[PDB]
Coordinates of C-alpha atoms and ligand atoms in Angstrom, one line a residue:
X15 CA 105.0 80.6 86.1
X16 CA 102.0 83.0 85.3
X17 CA 99.5 82.6 88.2
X18 CA 101.3 79.3 89.3
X19 CA 99.7 78.7 92.7
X20 CA 102.1 78.1 95.6
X21 CA 101.3 75.2 98.1
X22 CA 99.9 77.6 100.7
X23 CA 96.8 77.0 103.0
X24 CA 94.9 79.3 105.4
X25 CA 96.5 77.4 108.3
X26 CA 100.1 77.4 106.8
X27 CA 102.4 78.6 109.7
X28 CA 103.5 82.3 109.8
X29 CA 107.3 82.8 109.6
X30 CA 108.7 83.1 113.2
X31 CA 112.4 82.6 112.5
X32 CA 114.8 83.3 109.6
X33 CA 118.4 82.1 109.0
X34 CA 119.8 83.8 105.8
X35 CA 122.6 81.2 105.6
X36 CA 120.1 78.3 104.9
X37 CA 116.8 80.0 104.0
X38 CA 115.6 82.4 101.2
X39 CA 112.9 85.0 101.6
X40 CA 111.7 83.9 98.1
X41 CA 110.6 80.6 99.8
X42 CA 108.7 82.4 102.6
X43 CA 104.9 82.5 101.7
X44 CA 103.2 83.3 105.0
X45 CA 104.6 86.3 107.0
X46 CA 103.8 89.4 108.9
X47 CA 104.2 92.6 106.8
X48 CA 103.0 96.2 106.7
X49 CA 101.4 98.4 104.0
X50 CA 100.2 102.0 103.8
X51 CA 96.5 102.8 104.1
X52 CA 94.4 105.9 104.3
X53 CA 93.2 106.3 108.0
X54 CA 90.3 108.6 108.9
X55 CA 89.7 110.5 112.2
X56 CA 86.3 111.3 113.8
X57 CA 85.9 114.4 111.5
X58 CA 86.6 112.0 108.5
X59 CA 89.9 113.6 107.1
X60 CA 92.5 111.1 105.9
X61 CA 96.2 110.6 106.6
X62 CA 98.5 107.8 105.1
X63 CA 99.8 105.4 107.8
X64 CA 101.4 101.9 107.8
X65 CA 99.3 99.0 109.0
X66 CA 100.7 95.6 110.0
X67 CA 99.0 92.6 108.3
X68 CA 99.5 88.9 107.8
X69 CA 100.3 88.2 104.1
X70 CA 99.9 85.0 102.1
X71 CA 102.0 84.8 98.8
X72 CA 99.6 82.8 96.6
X73 CA 101.8 83.2 93.5
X74 CA 105.2 85.0 92.8
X75 CA 104.7 88.7 93.8
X76 CA 101.0 88.3 94.5
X77 CA 99.9 88.6 98.2
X78 CA 96.5 88.3 99.9
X79 CA 95.5 89.1 103.5
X80 CA 92.3 88.1 105.4
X81 CA 92.9 91.0 107.8
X82 CA 90.2 93.8 107.8
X83 CA 92.5 96.8 108.5
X84 CA 91.5 99.6 111.0
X85 CA 91.2 102.8 108.8
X86 CA 88.6 104.4 111.1
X87 CA 84.8 104.3 111.3
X88 CA 82.7 104.1 108.1
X89 CA 80.2 106.7 109.7
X90 CA 77.3 104.4 108.7
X91 CA 75.3 102.2 111.2
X92 CA 75.5 98.4 110.8
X93 CA 73.4 96.8 108.0
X94 CA 72.4 100.2 106.5
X95 CA 72.5 100.3 102.6
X96 CA 73.1 103.3 100.4
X97 CA 73.6 101.4 97.1
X98 CA 76.7 100.0 99.0
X99 CA 76.1 97.9 102.1
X100 CA 77.9 98.8 105.5
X101 CA 78.6 96.4 108.4
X102 CA 81.4 96.8 110.9
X103 CA 80.9 93.0 111.7
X104 CA 82.2 91.7 108.3
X105 CA 85.6 90.0 109.0
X106 CA 85.9 91.6 112.5
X107 CA 83.3 89.4 114.5
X108 CA 80.3 87.0 113.8
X109 CA 78.5 88.1 110.6
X110 CA 75.5 86.5 108.8
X111 CA 75.9 83.4 111.2
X112 CA 79.6 82.9 110.4
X113 CA 82.4 83.1 113.0
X114 CA 85.4 85.4 112.3
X115 CA 87.7 82.3 111.8
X116 CA 85.1 80.9 109.3
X117 CA 84.9 84.2 107.4
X118 CA 88.8 84.5 107.2
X119 CA 89.2 80.9 106.1
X120 CA 86.4 81.4 103.4
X121 CA 88.0 84.7 102.3
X122 CA 91.4 83.0 101.7
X123 CA 89.7 80.0 99.8
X124 CA 87.5 82.4 97.8
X125 CA 90.4 84.6 96.6
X126 CA 92.4 81.4 95.6
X127 CA 89.3 80.1 93.7
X128 CA 89.1 83.4 91.8
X129 CA 92.8 83.2 90.9
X130 CA 92.4 79.5 89.8
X131 CA 89.7 80.8 87.4
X132 CA 92.1 83.5 86.1
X133 CA 94.9 80.8 85.5
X134 CA 92.4 78.7 83.4
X135 CA 91.5 81.9 81.4
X136 CA 95.3 82.7 80.9
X137 CA 95.6 79.2 79.2
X138 CA 92.6 80.1 76.9
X139 CA 93.2 83.8 76.0
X140 CA 96.5 85.4 74.6
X141 CA 95.1 88.8 75.9
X142 CA 94.4 87.6 79.4
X143 CA 97.8 85.8 79.6
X144 CA 99.5 89.0 78.3
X145 CA 97.7 91.0 81.1
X146 CA 98.7 88.7 84.0
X147 CA 102.3 88.3 82.8
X148 CA 102.5 92.2 82.9
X149 CA 100.8 92.9 86.3
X150 CA 102.4 89.8 88.0
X151 CA 106.0 90.1 86.8
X152 CA 106.7 93.6 85.5
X153 CA 109.6 95.7 87.1
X154 CA 108.2 98.6 89.2
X155 CA 110.4 101.7 89.6
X156 CA 109.4 104.5 92.0
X157 CA 111.1 107.9 92.5
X158 CA 112.4 109.9 94.2
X159 CA 114.2 107.2 96.3
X160 CA 113.1 107.4 100.0
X161 CA 114.6 107.3 103.5
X162 CA 117.6 104.8 103.5
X163 CA 117.1 103.5 100.0
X164 CA 120.4 103.7 97.9
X165 CA 120.1 105.1 94.4
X166 CA 121.1 101.6 93.0
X167 CA 118.8 99.5 95.2
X168 CA 116.3 97.4 93.0
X169 CA 113.9 96.6 95.9
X170 CA 112.4 99.5 98.0
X171 CA 109.1 100.7 99.5
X172 CA 107.6 101.1 96.0
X173 CA 108.0 97.5 94.8
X174 CA 108.5 95.2 97.8
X175 CA 106.9 94.3 101.2
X176 CA 108.8 93.9 104.5
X177 CA 109.2 90.5 106.2
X178 CA 108.7 91.2 110.0
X179 CA 109.5 88.8 112.9
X180 CA 108.4 89.3 116.6
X181 CA 110.6 90.9 119.2
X182 CA 110.8 88.0 121.7
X183 CA 110.5 90.3 124.9
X184 CA 107.7 92.8 123.7
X185 CA 105.9 90.4 121.2
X186 CA 105.7 93.4 118.8
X187 CA 106.0 92.4 115.0
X188 CA 108.7 95.1 114.3
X189 CA 111.9 93.0 113.5
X190 CA 112.5 93.5 109.7
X191 CA 114.6 90.6 108.3
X192 CA 114.3 91.7 104.6
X193 CA 111.7 92.3 101.8
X194 CA 110.0 90.4 99.0
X195 CA 109.2 91.6 95.4
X196 CA 105.5 92.8 95.4
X197 CA 103.3 93.6 92.4
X198 CA 99.8 92.9 93.7
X199 CA 98.3 92.9 97.3
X200 CA 94.6 91.9 97.7
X201 CA 92.8 92.7 101.0
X202 CA 89.3 93.0 102.3
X203 CA 87.5 96.4 102.3
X204 CA 88.9 98.2 105.4
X205 CA 86.7 99.4 108.4
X206 CA 86.0 102.8 106.7
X207 CA 84.5 101.2 103.5
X208 CA 81.2 99.4 102.8
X209 CA 81.7 95.5 102.4
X210 CA 80.5 95.8 98.7
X211 CA 83.3 98.3 97.8
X212 CA 86.1 97.4 95.3
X213 CA 88.9 100.0 95.4
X214 CA 92.5 100.0 93.8
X215 CA 95.2 102.3 95.4
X216 CA 98.9 103.0 94.9
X217 CA 100.5 100.5 97.3
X218 CA 103.1 103.1 98.5
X219 CA 103.2 106.9 98.1
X220 CA 105.9 109.3 99.4
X221 CA 104.8 112.5 101.3
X222 CA 105.1 114.7 98.1
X223 CA 102.5 114.9 95.3
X224 CA 102.8 111.7 93.1
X225 CA 105.0 112.0 89.9
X226 CA 103.8 110.7 86.5
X227 CA 106.0 107.6 85.6
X228 CA 106.8 106.7 89.3
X229 CA 105.3 103.2 89.8
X230 CA 104.3 101.2 92.9
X231 CA 102.7 97.9 93.6
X232 CA 98.9 98.2 93.9
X233 CA 96.6 97.3 96.8
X234 CA 93.0 96.2 95.9
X235 CA 90.3 96.2 98.6
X236 CA 87.9 93.5 97.3
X237 CA 85.6 90.8 98.6
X238 CA 84.1 88.2 96.1
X239 CA 81.4 87.1 98.6
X240 CA 79.3 90.2 97.9
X241 CA 78.2 92.0 94.8
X242 CA 75.7 94.7 93.6
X243 CA 73.0 94.5 91.0
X244 CA 73.0 96.6 87.7
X245 CA 70.4 97.6 85.1
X246 CA 70.9 96.7 81.4
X247 CA 71.3 99.2 78.4
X248 CA 68.4 101.7 79.1
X249 CA 65.6 99.0 79.5
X250 CA 65.1 97.2 83.0
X251 CA 66.8 93.8 82.6
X252 CA 68.6 93.5 86.0
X253 CA 71.5 91.2 86.8
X254 CA 74.4 90.8 89.4
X255 CA 77.9 92.3 88.8
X256 CA 80.4 89.3 88.4
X257 CA 83.1 89.8 91.1
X258 CA 85.8 88.2 88.8
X259 CA 85.2 91.1 86.3
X260 CA 85.0 93.7 89.2
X261 CA 88.5 92.5 90.3
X262 CA 89.8 92.6 86.6
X263 CA 88.6 96.2 86.4
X264 CA 90.4 97.1 89.7
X265 CA 93.6 95.3 88.5
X266 CA 93.5 97.3 85.3
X267 CA 93.7 100.5 87.5
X268 CA 96.5 98.4 89.2
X269 CA 98.6 98.2 86.0
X270 CA 98.2 102.1 85.7
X271 CA 99.5 102.4 89.3
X272 CA 102.4 100.0 88.5
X273 CA 103.6 102.5 85.8
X274 CA 102.7 105.7 87.6
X275 CA 100.2 106.8 84.9
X276 CA 96.9 106.3 86.9
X277 CA 96.6 109.7 88.7
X278 CA 97.9 112.8 86.8
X279 CA 98.0 115.8 89.2
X280 CA 99.2 119.5 88.6
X281 CA 101.8 121.4 90.8
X282 CA 98.8 122.1 93.2
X283 CA 98.2 118.3 93.5
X284 CA 94.7 118.6 91.7
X285 CA 93.5 116.6 88.7
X286 CA 94.0 118.8 85.5
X287 CA 90.9 119.8 83.4
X288 CA 92.4 117.6 80.5
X289 CA 92.2 114.4 82.7
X290 CA 88.4 114.7 83.3
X291 CA 85.3 114.6 80.9
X292 CA 78.7 114.7 86.1
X293 CA 82.6 114.7 85.9
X294 CA 84.3 111.4 85.2
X295 CA 88.2 111.0 85.1
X296 CA 89.6 109.7 81.8
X297 CA 91.4 107.1 83.9
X298 CA 87.9 105.6 84.7
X299 CA 86.6 105.6 81.0
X300 CA 89.9 104.0 79.6
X301 CA 89.7 101.3 82.4
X302 CA 85.9 100.7 81.8
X303 CA 85.2 101.0 78.1
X304 CA 87.0 103.1 75.4
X305 CA 83.6 103.2 73.5
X306 CA 82.0 105.3 76.3
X307 CA 84.3 108.2 75.2
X308 CA 82.5 108.5 71.8
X309 CA 80.1 106.3 69.6
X310 CA 82.7 106.5 66.8
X311 CA 85.7 104.2 67.7
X312 CA 88.1 106.5 65.7
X313 CA 87.0 109.6 67.8
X314 CA 87.4 107.5 71.0
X315 CA 90.9 106.5 69.9
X316 CA 91.8 110.2 69.1
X317 CA 90.6 111.5 72.5
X318 CA 92.5 108.6 74.1
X319 CA 95.7 109.6 72.1
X320 CA 95.3 113.3 73.3
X321 CA 95.1 112.2 77.0
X322 CA 98.1 109.8 76.6
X323 CA 100.0 112.7 74.9
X324 CA 99.5 114.9 78.0
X325 CA 100.4 112.0 80.4
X326 CA 103.6 111.6 78.3
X327 CA 104.6 115.3 77.6
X328 CA 102.8 117.0 80.5
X329 CA 101.3 120.5 79.9
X330 CA 102.5 124.1 80.5
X331 CA 99.7 126.5 81.6
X332 CA 99.7 130.3 81.7
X333 CA 99.0 129.7 85.5
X334 CA 102.1 127.7 86.5
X335 CA 100.2 126.2 89.5
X336 CA 98.0 124.2 86.9
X337 CA 101.1 122.9 84.9
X338 CA 101.6 119.1 84.8
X339 CA 105.1 117.4 84.8
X340 CA 104.8 114.5 82.3
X341 CA 106.3 110.9 82.3
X342 CA 109.1 111.9 79.8
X343 CA 110.5 114.8 81.8
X344 CA 110.1 112.9 85.2
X345 CA 111.7 109.6 84.0
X346 CA 114.5 111.3 81.9
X347 CA 115.3 113.7 84.9
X348 CA 115.4 110.7 87.3
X349 CA 117.6 108.5 85.0
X350 CA 119.9 111.5 84.0
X351 CA 121.1 111.5 87.6
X352 CA 123.0 108.2 86.8
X353 CA 125.1 109.8 83.9
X354 CA 128.8 108.8 84.3
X355 CA 128.3 106.6 87.5
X356 CA 129.3 102.9 87.6
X357 CA 126.0 100.9 88.3
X358 CA 125.5 97.1 88.7
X359 CA 124.3 95.1 85.6
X360 CA 121.3 94.0 87.8
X361 CA 120.2 97.7 88.4
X362 CA 120.9 98.5 84.7
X363 CA 118.7 95.6 83.5
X364 CA 116.0 96.5 86.1
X365 CA 115.7 100.0 84.6
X366 CA 116.0 98.8 81.0
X367 CA 113.2 96.3 81.5
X368 CA 110.9 98.7 83.5
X369 CA 110.9 101.7 81.0
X370 CA 112.1 99.8 77.8
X371 CA 115.3 101.9 77.6
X372 CA 118.9 101.1 76.7
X373 CA 122.2 101.8 78.4
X374 CA 125.4 103.4 76.9
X375 CA 128.4 101.5 78.5
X376 CA 130.9 104.1 77.0
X377 CA 129.3 107.2 78.7
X378 CA 127.6 105.1 81.5
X379 CA 124.2 106.7 80.9
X380 CA 120.6 105.5 80.2
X381 CA 119.5 106.2 76.6
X382 CA 115.9 107.6 77.2
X383 CA 114.4 107.4 73.6
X384 CA 111.1 109.4 73.4
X385 CA 109.4 106.6 71.3
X386 CA 110.2 104.1 74.1
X387 CA 108.7 106.3 76.9
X388 CA 105.6 107.0 74.7
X389 CA 105.2 103.1 74.3
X390 CA 105.5 102.7 78.1
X391 CA 102.5 105.0 78.6
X392 CA 100.5 103.6 75.6
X393 CA 101.0 100.0 76.7
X394 CA 99.4 100.8 80.1
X395 CA 96.0 101.2 78.3
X396 CA 96.1 98.1 76.0
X397 CA 93.0 96.4 77.7
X398 CA 89.8 97.5 79.5
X399 CA 86.9 95.9 81.4
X400 CA 84.7 95.7 78.2
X401 CA 87.4 93.7 76.4
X402 CA 87.7 91.3 79.4
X403 CA 83.8 91.0 79.4
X404 CA 83.7 90.1 75.6
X405 CA 86.5 87.5 76.0
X406 CA 84.9 85.9 79.1
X407 CA 81.2 86.4 78.0
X408 CA 80.5 88.3 81.3
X409 CA 77.5 90.7 81.5
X410 CA 78.4 94.2 82.7
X411 CA 77.1 97.8 82.6
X412 CA 76.9 99.6 79.2
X413 CA 77.3 102.8 81.2
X414 CA 69.0 105.3 91.2
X415 CA 65.8 103.4 90.2
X416 CA 63.8 102.3 93.5
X417 CA 64.2 98.6 92.4
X418 CA 64.9 97.5 96.0
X419 CA 68.0 96.0 97.6
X420 CA 71.3 96.5 95.7
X421 CA 73.6 94.2 97.7
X422 CA 73.8 90.3 97.2
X423 CA 75.8 87.5 98.7
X424 CA 77.8 85.4 96.2
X425 CA 78.1 81.6 97.0
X426 CA 81.8 81.4 95.8
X427 CA 82.4 78.1 97.7
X428 CA 79.2 76.4 96.3
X429 CA 77.4 75.8 99.7
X430 CA 74.0 76.6 98.2
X431 CA 74.3 75.5 94.5
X432 CA 77.0 75.0 91.8
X433 CA 77.6 78.8 91.8
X434 CA 81.4 79.2 91.0
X435 CA 83.5 76.9 88.8
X436 CA 87.3 77.1 88.4
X437 CA 87.0 76.6 84.6
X438 CA 83.7 78.6 83.9
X439 CA 83.8 81.1 86.8
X440 CA 80.4 82.6 88.0
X441 CA 77.8 80.2 86.4
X442 CA 74.9 82.8 86.6
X443 CA 74.5 86.6 87.1
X444 CA 70.7 86.2 87.4
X445 CA 69.5 87.9 90.7
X446 CA 67.2 84.9 91.7
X447 CA 70.5 82.7 91.6
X448 CA 71.9 84.8 94.5
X449 CA 70.9 85.7 98.1
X450 CA 69.8 89.4 98.7
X451 CA 71.1 91.0 101.9
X452 CA 68.4 92.4 104.2
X453 CA 69.3 96.0 105.2
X454 CA 67.5 97.4 108.3
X455 CA 67.5 100.7 106.2
Ligands
CA240 CA1 82.0 101.1 93.9
ZN241 ZN1 87.3 102.1 88.0

C-alpha cells in the first residue's frame, strides 16, 4: 500500500453529495477542504487563518492541491529575482504563455509523476521504503485536544482534514460531513512566497506555543516546475537542484512535524540557544547532512545526541523564561490524564502505535517507559537529505557569486526533451539541460 496511487485525475469530479449509509469518506479522493496558513497584512506581520482548498487524495493520507492560496502580497514586483524568483501570475493567471487551467493540470500531473518516481525508489531501497511507510501511515497525536474534540477521539485537527459540501442556497463550501486521516499535504507556494520556494510547516497549530511531542500532519509548499542553481564544493562547477531531492528534504522536516520534534521553543516561545549553531538551527543541519555538524562522524553523532537529549528531557534554566518542556514530560503529562478511565481499544492502540508505549489493563493507564519515548525522538532523525542523495545518486550542495540567473524551469512533463523519467527521475542536473527564467531585475 506504500505510495499506491489511487485512480484520480485532474478532472475527477469534486464530492458534491455524501450518504453515510452507502458511502465511506475513505473512498472520497476529490473534495473541498480547509487548512491553516500564515496570512500577511500590508505591514507584513503574520496571523494563522484557515483557507478553503480543493484536495486530491493521490495515495492513502497524502493530499495535493493545485490552488495557490491567498496569504497576502509577496512585496516583490512580478518577474524580479533575489536568488528566489517572484511572480504573482504563477498558478493565478496566464504565466510563461500557459493558461491557469494548463498550469493547474500540469501541476497535478507533475506532482503525481514525482510520487511515481518515489514509489519506484521504495521498491529499490529499504531506507526509502522505511521513510515513506513512516510519513505516509504513522499515527499522529496532537495535544492539548482543541475545541469540541473529545479526549478519546482518534481523528482531530492535528491528523485529519475536513470534507466540506456546498450550502445549496448560499453556495459557500462550509457544510462539514466528516474528516479523513491526513499525514501529508502538498500545495503550490502561496501568494506571499517566491515560485522557487520549498517550505514545510506544521499542518495545524493551536493558539498556544507548540509543545514538544505534539504532532501534526505537515503541509509542504513545493513546485517541481522550477528550481535554483547551486555551486559545487568550493570550486565553480554549477548545476541545478533536483526538485525530487528538494521535496525529500522538506518531507524530512515533515517527519519532524509529525512527531512534534521539529521546532523546540522555550516558555517565551523563542528557539533555545542549544537548538542553534551565521546562526543555523540544529533542525536544519540534521535534516540536510549530519556531517556538516563536524568533520569527525563521532563528534557529529555526539552533538546530535546532546540535541536529542534536550528535545527529550527539556532543560531547566536559572531564567525560567528560557526553560524548555521536553517530549518526555509533555507526553507523560498528557497520557497520565487517562489514568483509571475506561478507553476504547481503538484509542489505546492509536496511542500505543504513535509513541511506542504499552497499556496496563489492571490500572487502566499508559505505561510511558523513558527508553520508548527516547526512541520516538531518536527515530525522527534516522535519515537526512545527504543519505537520500547517496542512495539516488543526486547531486546536492556540500554546504552570492554574480554568476547570473538563479532560477530555472524544469520540463517535468518532457515537452522539450526526455527530462524526467518515472524510473530514473531527473535525467540531468546540468544547467544547459534546463531553461533559465529571464528576470526583469
Ligand atoms: Ca529556499
Ligand atoms: Zn531545511
